From a paper:
BlaC is a class A serine β‐lactamase found in Mycobacterium tuberculosis (Wang et al., 2006). BlaC can efficiently hydrolyze penicillin antibiotics but has low activity against later‐generation oxyimino‐cephalosporins, such as ceftazidime, due to their bulky C7β aminothiazole‐oxyimino side chain (Sun et al., 2023; Wang et al., 2006). We analyzed the structural changes in mutants of the β‐lactamase BlaC from Mycobacterium tuberculosis obtained via directed evolution for increased ceftazidime hydrolysis activity.
In a screen for BlaC mutants with improved ceftazidime resistance in an Escherichia coli expression system at three temperatures (23, 30, and 37°C), the BlaC variant P167S/D240G (PD) was found at 30°C, exhibiting a 16‐fold increased resistance for ceftazidime as compared to the wild‐type (WT). Grown at 23 and 37°C, the resistance of this PD variant was eightfold greater than that of WT. The parent variant for evolution, PD, showed a melting temperature (T m) of 52.8°C, a decrease of 9.2°C compared to WT BlaC (62°C) (van Alen et al., 2023). In the P167S and PD variants, peak doubling is observed for many amides, indicating that a large part of the protein populates two states.
Numbering used by the authors: 28 to 83, 86 to 145, 145A, 145B, 145C, 145D, 146 to 238, 240 to 252, ...
Write the structure that this text describes.
């Protein structure tokens, strides 16, 4: 059989474009479907963003209090908009940016990295340092990404983001103490239950970071561990460019793609 045929059937059933990459391992072949096509990051960048902040600072930095105002609340910010009067530490911002996909938290972390484009250049440079020549972040988050499909800004590929996540969570891009923080925040994400997690059996561990936007955009990037403790990186991206800027994102597409992947890996 050919797994690519089954992904193609998902595209036709959901009226969508689907991108998948699972890196090869010591025991398995790579899974790749539109893996070198660009898809919007949406909030999936927030996981490597936290890595960038961890990489460039001692862990004492997580205690630094960041203050901000109600006028700094941009895009969907479930945590930050409750803490305007207190502020939030860098560690709390990392937590919110991953686990609640918090936009303001991410924008404050980008500012913490520094420089032109409100930290977006610095973030892209971090990805370049991990061997990613493809991905780019170009703007702070002011809304969920509903920019036209033709705009390359704020895009990655399943292949590129998967290999970034591989190095961050499973490789040696971060020292163990920093790696643990990233892993735990993704492990306790609150936004991903209906995506990759929904396609893997309950005895597999799943850690993830979602993204969702206009033009039917729905993404999930994950690391999964089998019931015997073998890890795999799974990146699934999707959009519906022909359905208009307000095309509905389909979490179920990601869940079914992940089920297809689990069938290969189990």
């Amino acid at each position: 059989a050919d797994l690519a045929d089954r992904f193609a059937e998902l595209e036709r059933r959901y009226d969508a474009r689907l991108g998948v990459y699972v890196p090869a391992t010591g025991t398995t072949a790579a899974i790749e479907y539109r893996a070198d096509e660009r898809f919007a990051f949406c909030s999936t960048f927030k996981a490597p963003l936290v890595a960038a902040v961890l990489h460039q600072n001692p862990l004492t930095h997580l205690d630094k209090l960041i203050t901000y105002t109600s006028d700094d609340i941009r895009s969907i910010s479930p945590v930050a908009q409750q803490h305007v009067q207190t502020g939030m530490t860098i560690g709390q911002l990392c937590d919110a940016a991953i686990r609640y996909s918090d936009g303001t938290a991410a924008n404050l972390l980008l500012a913490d990295l520094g420089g032109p484009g409100g930290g977006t250049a610095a973030f892209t440079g971090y990805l370049r340092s991990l061997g990613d020549t493809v991905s780019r972040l170009d703007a702070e988050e002011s809304e969920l990404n509903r920019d036209p499909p033709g705009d390359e800004r704020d895009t990655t590929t399943p292949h590129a983001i998967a290999l970034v996540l591989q190095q961050l969570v499973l490789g040696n891009a971060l020292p163990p103490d920093k790696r643990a923080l990233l892993t735990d925040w993704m492990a306790r994400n609150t936004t991903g239950a209906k995506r990759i997690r929904a396609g893997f059996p309950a005895d597999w561990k799943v850690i993830d970071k979602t993204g969702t936007g206009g033009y039917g955009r729905a993404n999930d990037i994950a690391v999964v561990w089998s019931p015997t403790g073998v890890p795999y990186v799974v990146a699934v991206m999707s959009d519906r460019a022909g359905g208009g800027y307000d095309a509905e994102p389909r979490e179920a597409l990601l869940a079914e793609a992940a089920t297809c992947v689990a069938g290969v890996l189990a």
